[PDB]
Amino acid sequence: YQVLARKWRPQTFADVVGQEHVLTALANGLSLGRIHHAYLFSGTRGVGKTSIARLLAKGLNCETGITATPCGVCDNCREIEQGRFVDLIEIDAASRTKVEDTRDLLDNVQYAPARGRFKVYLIDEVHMLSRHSFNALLKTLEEPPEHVKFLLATTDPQKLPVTILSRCLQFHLKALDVEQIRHQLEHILNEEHIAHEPRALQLLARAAEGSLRDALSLTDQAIASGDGQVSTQAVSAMLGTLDDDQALSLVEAMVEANGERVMALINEAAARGIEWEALLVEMLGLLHRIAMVQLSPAALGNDMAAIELRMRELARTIPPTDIQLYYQTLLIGRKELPYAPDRRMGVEMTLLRALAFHPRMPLPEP
Amino acid sequence: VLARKWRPQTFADVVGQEHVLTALANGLSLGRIHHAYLFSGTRGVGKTSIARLLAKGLNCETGITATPCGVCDNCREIEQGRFVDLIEIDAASRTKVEDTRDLLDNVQYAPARGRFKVYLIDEVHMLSRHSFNALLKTLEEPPEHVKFLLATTDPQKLPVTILSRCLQFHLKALDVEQIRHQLEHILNEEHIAHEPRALQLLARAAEGSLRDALSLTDQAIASGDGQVSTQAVSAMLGTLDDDQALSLVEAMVEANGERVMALINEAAARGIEWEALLVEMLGLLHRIAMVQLSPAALGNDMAAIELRMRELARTIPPTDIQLYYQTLLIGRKELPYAPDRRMGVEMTLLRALAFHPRMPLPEP
Amino acid sequence: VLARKWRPQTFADVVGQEHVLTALANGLSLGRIHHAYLFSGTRGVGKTSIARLLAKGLNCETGITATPCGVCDNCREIEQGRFVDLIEIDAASRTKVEDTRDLLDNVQYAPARGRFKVYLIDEVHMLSRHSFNALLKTLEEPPEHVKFLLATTDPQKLPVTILSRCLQFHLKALDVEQIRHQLEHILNEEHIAHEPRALQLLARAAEGSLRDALSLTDQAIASGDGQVSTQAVSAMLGTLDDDQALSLVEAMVEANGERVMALINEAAARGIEWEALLVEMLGLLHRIAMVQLSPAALGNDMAAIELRMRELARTIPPTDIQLYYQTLLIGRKELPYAPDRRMGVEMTLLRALAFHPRMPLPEP
Amino acid sequence: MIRLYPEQLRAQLNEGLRAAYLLLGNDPLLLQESQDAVRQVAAAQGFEEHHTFSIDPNTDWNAIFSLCQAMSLFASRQTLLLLLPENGPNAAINEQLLTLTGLLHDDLLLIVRGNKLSKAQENAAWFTALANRSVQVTCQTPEQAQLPRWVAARAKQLNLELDDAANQVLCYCYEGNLLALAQALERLSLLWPDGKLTLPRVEQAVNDAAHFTPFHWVDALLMGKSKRALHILQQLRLEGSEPVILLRTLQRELLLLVNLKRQSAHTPLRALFDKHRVWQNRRGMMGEALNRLSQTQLRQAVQLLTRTELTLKQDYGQSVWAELEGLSLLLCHKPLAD
Amino acid sequence: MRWYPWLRPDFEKLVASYQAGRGHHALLIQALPGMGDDALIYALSRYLLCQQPQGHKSCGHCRGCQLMQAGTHPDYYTLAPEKGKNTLGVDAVREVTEKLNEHARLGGAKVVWVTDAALLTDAAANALLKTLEEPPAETWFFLATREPERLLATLRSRCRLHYLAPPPEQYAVTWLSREVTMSQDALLAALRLSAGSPGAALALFQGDNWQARETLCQALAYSVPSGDWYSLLAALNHEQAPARLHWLATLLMDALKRHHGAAQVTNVDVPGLVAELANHLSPSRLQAILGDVCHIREQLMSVTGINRELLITDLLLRIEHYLQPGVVLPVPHL
């Protein structure tokens, strides 16, 4: 009974990944006691904005003292990591259901903590606060009590008036790199003693876009559906994205210019419920790697070895000029996709074009 | 109606949610049961159906299985929605707000009949903040014998503390043909008269939702004859039900202008939905290219066109067929950019006429 | 923080507003005091600092001087912001709207402690119309013993009737090489380690203002934990040295993909905004296109580059320049649709590399 | 209506205060001094109350009319100062003024102030009504020959020995902004308590002060070398100048070049400049521009300005400055079709 | 809100079903602007909201008719979009749904009307559906939309679509000759420049619009043969820029159509123009211009506040470069 997204939910400032400089920043102030009345955390959704906001409030109210290194056992620490704390008021300005509570709580700030030292106010995406409850925050920020502190979050810092930005100590949480999540996922899986294939992890690392929460959530599904193993054949299938062989044959079908085979692979593929957008993407990247390898034969990645002999063959046999056309055809085809009458169709047509405009041999006529 | 009659009774009756069905089955078959499951996805894609089968697989008298027998009392009662250990909660209901709140504040830790006390919560993101915490609290201290099956079209609206405690399954909308194929199967087994183009029009109309697909199929049965006929279907939706899209394509490709502009006008007089017209043309331009690749591509009710369609296939260059498709697609994007939707359509077709090999040329 | 700790305490501590400091000093030293002073200019250039020193020079117990002693009670209190005869008004504050309005409607004509009752109004252009007239009225009938020191980033937003009654001083943003010299000095007096490149990456960052440079450096310290190193400073401050933006184009037109990819991986390790890099390249190729028609195309900071650009401008055909400008143009548009942004760039260059005029790829 | 110059006011004011004083013109200093001269003479009488009401479509009409419809019960007299609109009185205003004009008497001094009225606006019921009772003071800025003379006069009363070359320097900078020339003289007096404003001294302080109009960017941008325009453009971000306000300064002069370059063989350059009423020395510079910018260059510069105009209004924060740099570069070098 | 004559034949069968029971509880009317879409909905509801109807119309006395003439009524519900915004809310809908869930205050039929269903929030669509599925006995609905395709397929299935067909042109012109005296040739142009809507056609004249339109064709007639397109600046640069740009577009279309020998032309008003135009401009050149005019008209309507002057000056000068030999005109994107 444990899905990685919860079993690895950061407990310490050390456990969080890669955003060194925002952790260091909060480390200093939690040591030196340099607490600002308002902390703004910006960045895409999925990055630990709320997550890092907790570990701050976890060191603000902790019974061990204002610490940058909270103790995971004190009643305050446990209750914070569980969403429920007397003073930690978590408001989702983005909720259609909590509009009144959002408005009321902000019009009635509780100046004296009941248990914890500070009366923390975690608010996700404040640029979406009703104009009514927005002014309440203004009035409380200009002159805030010593006990109350704010922890603002946002997806778009620009929709926030300069009158607010200037009143908070802003922090930009950057997204995570692919092989920074991949490397993380491998490590976590290595520590849980769970099998895996490296090309499966890259797919999971791409799957979530810079969102480690989601990467884990994604890795738990993969485990449940691959019965104990995070295998490409269990993963590739959640995303509906083709195994590098399924995808690789399509690319070959296209280049040999045999149409039946292509539509056949597309039909056989439809059977296992693809994500039509994805079938285009993998083919593009595959074409991309072949282009690189024609420059530096050392280009291929490590798990590519299964398809290494085929990738390498195309590489020396197919003119880069041609490879540029196939990549263009397929991309342009991706631009089209939402306008195509049907997703599956956009993909078929994009391919039938590559076939009709094939450089070495093309569809004929009288 | 069809929707209730054809509700999945087994995972096998489930259409295209493979990645989800494979994982749930593996877990069920190996006795690996988590305390909470989350099913997300758009409308009528199968969230409740799958949640219901899972509850069924969990309480089947036969044992915990990925294949509920479907005939034991637990299975029949769950089916009827009258099973004492399957508590259904609708967070989206304005009427059951108190019951929603109370049931969640008073979890029944010991099943009365089945081996598990199951809670199924629809649109769980619409719960009050009070209930969210009630739920969280229970998910944090996992009562045994109690399982939570959550469903929602908006996982993100959910507190990450809760989402993190569930096994999340993302259901996908469905491809057109995937729905088309199911509709058929239902109408065959149900002995109801049906045509090919109807099932197409019906599937495409239901955007990825089998739920709606059937609800439309049911209003086609009421509006038209007790027959799912092209005439009825395109009577609800608003399709021309005419060879207009095709003849337009035929003219366009001969560079007839006069007739292309003519057709556009007559078309306009019957109040066509200009985007719908362009979509038909694109679809036609596509099948053609398929026919040029493997001559068996002309389908089911398209037998009516067969001759005309094939004639284009053999007479127009595929290289060109792509060109027309492209030019029209583009047209669809710029369509709302145009001062008027019709001039948008005229802008496009005249465009394919000019950028016509062996077509309109310039002069002094 | 550094900004508050290093606030100018004497005119000699002020960085680069010579023309203003010379005039204020001359006036103060000769006992020529006007009734109202206006300090305009952008952000963090020293408006409030200078206004504060003037108030200090005006009320120093030592006498009206251009060199406040800094140790008398009047000087210390002004410094602390707790001087009874220095009334600070913030027209830009949403919270002090009433106090702003009241204080201006009730000018205190007789100082309680110092020889002058001084009013310092921040962002004076943000005052209500009501207060503007209150102020005008006072500036028209100049209470003696009362001086008005106004500050603003937008003099023009001010009623010309008021602007006309002040002695106006225009503060300038600061020169990058002006800020750097001052950063270099502060750190030294603080014994805080620093690399010469680091201070420049900061001087550039703070747009023309010290106030900002200081807070940026304060942040730099906390992240470099004690030191001010180019790496910690390049951690927040988007960097330029790591940018092959011109060395990528060189590498491009030179044809050594080996280098071209090495550059891209290098760039990648630094966390670039892939589309910006394509802008820098497209904005460079365009300028090299311009140096070929007129040599007067070399800019205000084109200097380091100069020889590198000038070499391209003569050794690369204009046709070929257009060809490369186009290839990168197209690759920019294709970017967001690529399977991965880095991949787009990598492939965009591989395209330039495949369709290169000299030394294009080989095939057996 | 004794029509007179700012200098003539103090002498007239001595004979007798009139019913109304209209201060019509554009000079900030001139308007203020005349205004001050009237009031200083009035408050001497017994004119305690003073009032000001601004006329323009929308700024409280029924209040203006009524505020003067009331007499003076225990005869506390107030100055009424009507502030005319920026454009000048429209068809409707002429009436509201007329209604006010009938609110006069010996104990209610009216002062109207705005720029110069057009010969048309001068036939208006309101204007012709005061035409026998009032005095008009023409507050307008000095011609090219007397701008220096005015600076010398103004400086001499500030007890300043302003050299002729220096005087010219001050004039070529801030040309026409008398408020600036006066401030400048006053600042220059703090700098050199001495009094002796020699060319070297004044020159140093003027160049050191480093102030630049958006126009100096354009004036430079007129086929003048880019170096200084790029300099001024990156020195225009140091005075706190919005981008938008720059684009509409470039546009106005750019579209003007478009129309002019278009009219070659339409009418010799000479008369055309008069026709457009901006040729105010800018002529030789405007024509210098016209002579090396091709019909096509001018066009390209219009597309760029347009993208920028949209880029600045579609993402509403896409760093237009960059484009302004790129734009300033097109007005000096021959472009391509890329 | 004026009852036109062509609204009758349709109004006849629409009451003929509300009298014989065949009435459809949800009605979606599609019609061009100024086709009297307005008046048909209102005219129909007055028939159903009568306590003592006289056969085909009301009495004028009864509580319904009176509270009807007084506008304010407990069974009539106007669902106008939220004042200020260009869309409708999920709220308004829900509050009228439950408003009908309770007995009719006057004991009879309840009616609902929508300004334009194609302007509502996606959530607002679904929120409306459930009620049409659970129809409160004897209630009535009236949807209305210019474009019924941009409406949710599942929604337009529940209602009965009714096409409010622009009257035959011969009838629309005669009706028009009465409301304004102008050449029939002009009259037809207005009609065609309104998709057949006689109401909008009529309104084309009532300002000084038509005169404003005549100014445009004169400017165009000068420019076409001269090349100086930048002369249109005065004719186009105006707050009415978009309505004008559209005008300029219809002329462009027509010239394009003539190259393909298309019989029908919108601007019958000035065939001499469309001719010359088509003569001096290749079908490609025309395509090119048609678009820029098209996309530029849109940025004027959409983007909050660009320079009407700059943009257009740019459109104009740009048009002239397409006209120059050797230039490679643009192609649509995506």
Ligand SMILES: Nc1ncnc2c1ncn2[C@@H]1O[C@H](COP(=O)(O)OP(=O)(O)O)[C@@H](O)[C@H]1O
């Ligand atoms: N994946 C599916 N396979 C088969 N039938 C389906 C599927 N999804 C939906 N249906 C049909 O739609 C009806 C409602 O779908 P439901 O499971 O309640 O979807 P959701 O919970 O996503 O709204 C079902 O009773 C069934 O007839």
Ligand SMILES: Nc1ncnc2c1ncn2[C@@H]1O[C@H](COP(=O)(O)OP(=O)(O)O)[C@@H](O)[C@H]1O
């Ligand atoms: N000209 C200057 N010389 C020295 N320090 C300055 C100067 N301008 C700004 N600073 C620094 O910036 C901080 C804030 O600047 P401030 O005087 O309030 O300027 P302004 O009001 O123009 O924003 C000061 O406390 C000081 O440390």
Ligand SMILES: [Zn+2]
């Ligand atoms: Zn603790």
Ligand SMILES: [Zn+2]
């Ligand atoms: Zn069973």
Ligand SMILES: [Zn+2]
């Ligand atoms: Zn002192």
Ligand SMILES: [Zn+2]
């Ligand atoms: Zn009646």
